[model samples]
Target: GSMSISISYSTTYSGWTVADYLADWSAYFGDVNHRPGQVVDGSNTGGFNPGPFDGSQYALKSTASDAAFIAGGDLHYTLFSNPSHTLWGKLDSIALGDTLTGGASSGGYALDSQEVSFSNLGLDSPIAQGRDGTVHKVVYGLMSGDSSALQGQIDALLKAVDPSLSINSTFDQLAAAGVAHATPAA
Candidate 1:
């Protein structure tokens, strides 16, 4: 709404996975460490942010109902067309769900719950500070089995959109290349 280009993009593609990472280690790099600071306390239950830090969005697990999964989600800013952005992911904590099966399956029908909020890449936390971000490089695994193949799926779609996007080719690969976030002044 603010810009001529809305830059709205959302990926609800099935067969692909979701994941979220912890923010306790944003420190240790560029001489500024958020590791000493507070970790972000959120799940899908938590919302999103643009960031004093460079957290463009939340990292997630391949599984939906991870510890960070929330039932419903609301996105204020989404860049659908030609949305070329980056989010650095690091893991400190994660939640995994369980499946129940037996004759006791009365009131429940496979217990297929709703869904986990997958917008963690941009949420704000106490851990955020200028340049404490991206100092610690970590890669978030979106799918479980084949990472290279999975990245290929993402890469193929992006390259189709624009051949020049040789920059942020895949989610896991590009954002982790180096410190892209703005740093503190000396």
Candidate 2:
């Protein structure tokens, strides 16, 4: 059997301009702990790629204005020398104060995952700053979509290993007992 699905994901961090946020920035993500205004460092956990950073984490610590930033004349991208996949040894671009989208799906399933976070200007890392002097904007990315052929193969293989593997299925001898009832004498 073959199934197909698609899901769109994106989010906006607004209320201020990109210039406002870049004046200062500092933030964190994933399994890192929080300590009031302190920026916790850790792996991004469940992204296509995560990090520990080479010298310091990648950030948007420039004094460029909104027009310059949008025009690509500003620092809207960063590089991670110590990383994985395309993100490693490559420039990871971000669109500040704009739409950020990232997620994927195959013929078997789909998902649209969007997330937004703030930066702490007091933390000494401008990457996480909200906006200018207690302000904020959006930092977004668009992740690419993928095909389902590989996922279908994996699902098929798993089903063979576990005969009772089914998402929406009726109960049988080898499966849990499912009840089928009639409407109240209708």
Candidate 3:
């Protein structure tokens, strides 16, 4: 008779969002300190805000009156040429202030900018400033619900800044990379 053995793997954290993934990636590769204000909610209602970078309190306001920074639901510090810490990038839906319905056919938006401290994003009509007084460049259109498409764009953006920068789409990969709390208890 012969004996057999098998191994298996599974992922954790079904609630993980693009924001969470990026936070882990930034920490793993860029060696950025995890400050207190980083928000990882999976909706447009939360994200990696300037608060973490500028030492301000992280606040995500869901009220319609807000200017909607990270309107794309994803923003991160590009690890490439950010010696001054002013370089940032994001993936947003063309629909600037509108609610993201996550439609597969929705249009996409991408931006990489080197912003001045406390500068206004300069939209046609200003509503309210971001929590930290920095305006991320805004775009208008529908949001794509397609994860693969978003992932591709995200990968490209990271590569554009630094070829070594990459992203992992699953919690398992994040866990393998030693990202903390990647697999929270169920």
Arrange candidates, best TM-score first.
Answer: 3, 1, 2
lDDT of 2 at 156: 46
Worst 10 residues of 3 by lDDT: 1-10
Highest lDDT against the true fold, candidate = 3
- Model 1 scores a C-alpha lDDT of 0.23
What residue runs in model 1 are displaced by over 4 Å at the alpha carbon?
1-146, 166-186
lDDT of each: 0.23, 0.22, 0.28
List TM-scores for all candidates, in order. 0.20, 0.19, 0.23
Q: Where is model 3 more than 4 Å wrong at Cα?
A: 1-55, 64-135, 138-168, 183-186
Q: For model 3, how does the per-residue alpha-carbon lDDT over 1-186 read when each residue is reduced to its tens digit?
A: 011111111233433543454343223223111223642344332323333332111222223232222332334332233232222233222211212222223233212210101111121212233322122322211111122333444455444444544444343433343331221121
lDDT of 2 at 154: 25
RMSD (Å) of each candidate, 1 decimal? 19.6, 20.6, 18.2
Instruction: Return the candidate ranking by lDDT, descending.
Output: 3, 1, 2
lDDT of 2 by residue, 91-157 (tens): 2222223221232222211112222221111112133332221111222221111112222322343
How well does candidate 2 match the true structure in TM-score terms? 0.19
Residue 162, candidate 2: alpha-carbon lDDT: 57
Model 1 shows how many backbone clashes?
27
Model 2 residue 145 distance off true place after TM-score fit, in angstroms: 29
